[PDB]
């Protein structure tokens, strides 16, 4: 019953102890109660570095992490993003 091997496999690395560390600084990401991202919401906290972004960009850049057709950027998704890189050396 291996279907969603995308986000089962980060699961399984991602214990609930490492799971928590990241929860403080999700809802952060989000700033709408703490549910399911999107593409403007997460435009915000990625100006904070120091640049101009654009909406029509945005679209583009979750386009790479969002091979699934939500749109959203869910708990259930943000995982399986930084678990690619964590495998071997990325
Ligand atoms: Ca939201
Ligand atoms: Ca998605």
Same mark, same amino acid.
């Given at each position: 019953?291996?279907?969603t ?11 609930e102890?490492?799971?928590? +560390?990241?929860? =403080?600084?999700?809802?952060?990401? $989000?700033? *709408? !109660?703490? /549910?399911? %991202?999107?593409?403007? #919401?997460?435009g ?7 640049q101009?972004?654009?909406?029509? +960009?945005?679209d =583009?850049?979750?386009?790479?992490? $969002?091979? *699934? !057709?939500? /749109?959203? %950027?869910?708990?259930? #998704? ?13």
């Amino acid at each position: 019953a291996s279907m969603t091997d995308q986000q089962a496999e980060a699961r399984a690395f991602l214990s609930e102890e490492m799971i928590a +560390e990241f929860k =403080a600084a999700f809802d952060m990401f $989000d700033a *709408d !109660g703490g /549910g399911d %991202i999107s593409t403007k #919401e997460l435009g915000t906290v990625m100006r904070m570095l120091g640049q101009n972004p654009t909406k029509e +960009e945005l679209d =583009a850049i979750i386009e790479e992490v $969002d091979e *699934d !057709g939500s /749109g959203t %950027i869910d708990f259930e #998704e943000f995982l399986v993003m930084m678990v690619r890189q964590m495998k071997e050396d990325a």
